[PDB]
Amino acid sequence: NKTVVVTTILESPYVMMKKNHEMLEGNERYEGYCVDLAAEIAKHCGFKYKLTIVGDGKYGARDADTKIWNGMVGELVYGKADIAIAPLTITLVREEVIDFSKPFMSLGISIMIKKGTPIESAEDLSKQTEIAYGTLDSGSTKEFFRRSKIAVFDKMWTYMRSAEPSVFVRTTAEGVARVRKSKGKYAYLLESTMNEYIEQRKPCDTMKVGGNLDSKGYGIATPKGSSLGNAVNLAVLKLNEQGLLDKLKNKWWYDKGECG
Amino acid sequence: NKTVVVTTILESPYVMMKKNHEMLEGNERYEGYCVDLAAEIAKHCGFKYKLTIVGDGKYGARDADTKIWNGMVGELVYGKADIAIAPLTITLVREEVIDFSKPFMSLGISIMIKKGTPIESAEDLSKQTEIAYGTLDSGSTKEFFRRSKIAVFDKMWTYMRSAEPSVFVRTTAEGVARVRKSKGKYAYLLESTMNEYIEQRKPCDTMKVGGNLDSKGYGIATPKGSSLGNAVNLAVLKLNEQGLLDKLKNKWWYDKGECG
Numbered sequence: 001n002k003t004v005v006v007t008t009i010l011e012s013p014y015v016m017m018k019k020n021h022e023m024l025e026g027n028e029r030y031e032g033y034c035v036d037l038a039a040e041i042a043k044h045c046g047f048k049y050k051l052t053i054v055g056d057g058k059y060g061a062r063d064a065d066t067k068i069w070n071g072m073v074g075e076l077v078y079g080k081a082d083i084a085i086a087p088l089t090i091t092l093v094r095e096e097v098i099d100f101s102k103p104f105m106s107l108g109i110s111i112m113i114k115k116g117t118p119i120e121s122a123e124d125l126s127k128q129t130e131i132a133y134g135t136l137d138s139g140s141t142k143e144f145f146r147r148s149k150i151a152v153f154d155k156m157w158t159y160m161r162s163a164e165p166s167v168f169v170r171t172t173a174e175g176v177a178r179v180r181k182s183k184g185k186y187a188y189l190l191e192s193t194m195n196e197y198i199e200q201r202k203p204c205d206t207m208k209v210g211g212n213l214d215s216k217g218y219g220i221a222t223p224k225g226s227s228l229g230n231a232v233n234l235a236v237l238k239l240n241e242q243g244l245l246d247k248l249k250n251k252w253w254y255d256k257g258e259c260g
Numbered sequence: 261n262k263t264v265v266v267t268t269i270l271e272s273p274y275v276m277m278k279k280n281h282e283m284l285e286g287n288e289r290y291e292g293y294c295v296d297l298a299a300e301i302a303k304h305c306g307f308k309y310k311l312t313i314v315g316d317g318k319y320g321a322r323d324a325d326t327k328i329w330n331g332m333v334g335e336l337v338y339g340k341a342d343i344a345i346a347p348l349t350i351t352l353v354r355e356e357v358i359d360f361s362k363p364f365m366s367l368g369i370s371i372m373i374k375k376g377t378p379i380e381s382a383e384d385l386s387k388q389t390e391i392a393y394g395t396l397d398s399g400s401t402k403e404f405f406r407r408s409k410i411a412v413f414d415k416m417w418t419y420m421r422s423a424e425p426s427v428f429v430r431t432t433a434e435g436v437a438r439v440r441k442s443k444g445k446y447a448y449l450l451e452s453t454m455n456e457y458i459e460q461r462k463p464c465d466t467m468k469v470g471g472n473l474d475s476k477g478y479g480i481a482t483p484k485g486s487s488l489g490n491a492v493n494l495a496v497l498k499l500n501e502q503g504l505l506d507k508l509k510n511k512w513w514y515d516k517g518e519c520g
């Protein structure tokens with residue numbers, strides 16, 4: 001057996017640097033839902049591991065011209081990492097190049113607004129131009145709008161793709177900051193899981209509105225043909241059935257909520 | 261290529277006999293969410309199929325003594341069917357003997373009450389004895405309580421396993437009938453999906469209360485090593501991403517709701 005190289009991404013509250021990470025080493029430098037999940041998965045599958053933060057800080061997309069995969073998906077595809085344990089959305093294009101465990105968490109694209117913003121749905125956003133809106137610059141959310149044939153979402157994509165200044169952001173933190181500093185003139189489309197987390201964070205000035213636009217899940221990913229695939233999948237199912245995944249979500253989302 | 265034998269189960273609104281099934285033949289005799297799903301899956305995977313109703317009318321469990329698997333899982337395990345397209349819950353014990361596609365529908369165990377029943381949660385049920393409660397006699401819901409280490413659910417299991425007369429029912433329809441005819445003295449624990457469907461059916465006298473006890477999903481199942489596994493999994497992801505699964509749920513659950 002060899003130490004398993006785990007690729008993941010800095011995204012709250014999945015993986016975050018501990019306040020005093022400078023005084024720590026190895027896996028101890030990080031904390032979060034996926035850090036806890038990695039420990040449980042490794043324990044149940046019987047392997048030693050090393051957490052690493054994805055080099056380019058991306059989730060995973062294929063360049064239409066070079067055909068090269070970036071982000072965590074890329075690290076798995078090219079063998080730079082053995083497994084990805086992060087909020088990586090299970091999608092068809094990814095399932096074609098890597099393997100996914102059954103989902104360990106549910107989510108859907110949602111709307112985040114600065115409290116008081118006169119928006120209640122995606123339809124509302126699409127029917128007005130006063131309030132700008134966008135998504136994470138790369139990832140499954142952006143692709144959802146790019147590919148959607150649903151009238152409302154296609155109308156939103158047409159606006160976002162040519163809006164200026166750009167409505168796309170590099171990170172969730174940037175999207176949240178933009179919502180918080182735009183006096184209600186910017187709304188952010190992001191995964192419900194991140195939205196729900198931020199809503200319970202000071203200064204408690206954001207809120208999730210409307211229902212989710214879709215329904216999907218995050219899965220643990222391995223390179224196709226990996227000897228870890230089967231065990232990891234069974235571990236996810238066992239952890240869900242034992243109520244551990246629900247326990248972990250409450251721990252990182254609500255137990256220490258900062259908004260009452 | 262050979263005609264694919266699909267095993268499924270009579271469970272509303274997944275698979276139901278058309279009103280005039282007697283005048284129809286083959287797959288045309290049935291209608292429902294899973295009937296529509298089977299057609300879409302077959303279309304995308306390029307295969308011809310024959311719908312069959314599981315012989316013993318069960319979902320799938322292993323006898324602790326004979327080690328024999330019954331229900332739809334059994335039909336796959338022993339090669340009597342090539343694929344199962346029904347509301348079959350993805351569980352660890354099943355994943356060990358058959359393969360599951362990524363989930364095509366989300367669900368969680370929930371509580372169904374006759375309107376007016378003074379119950380709002382599982383905790384409420386566990387802390388009283390006036391109102392009896394049970395689950396489907398066999399399936400993942402019963403197993404959830406049998407295996408749960410969570411205090412409230414373990415307390416509920418202890419009561420249900422020895423309650424008399426028996427609180428377990430043979431079919432969902434029987435559980436619903438019992439709730440409807442027990443004047444509020446019986447509450448039924450069942451999958452949220454079925455609960456949500458029944459709530460919009462006349463005589464509109466039942467309702468879902470409290471949050472779900474767990475979070476999981478239904479998956480399409482194939483015998484381990486099946487040449488259909490990969491294609492079927494990709495088909496499920498494609499159908500979800502195209503919004504077809506959401507369209508199908510609205511079609512069979514809400515579009516024709518009977519309660520306003």
Ligand SMILES: COc1ccc(C(=O)N2CCCC2=O)cc1
Nearest residue numbers: 106215216217363366475476477
């Ligand atoms: C936590 O349990 C689950 C998380 C995610 C999923 C899932 O992948 N999907 C896809 C379409 C609807 C749905 O729920 C199913 C169950």
Ligand SMILES: N[C@@H](Cn1cc(F)c(=O)[nH]c1=O)C(=O)O
Nearest residue numbers: 059087088089139140141190191
């Ligand atoms: N999970 C996504 C990445 N990702 C993350 C977010 F927080 C969000 O709002 N949108 C998104 O696409 C993926 O796997 O690409």
Ligand SMILES: N[C@@H](Cn1cc(F)c(=O)[nH]c1=O)C(=O)O
Nearest residue numbers: 319347348349399400401450451
């Ligand atoms: N989906 C389950 C079967 N099943 C169905 C129900 F409607 C219910 O309430 N409980 C249950 O276990 C399985 O796969 O065993």
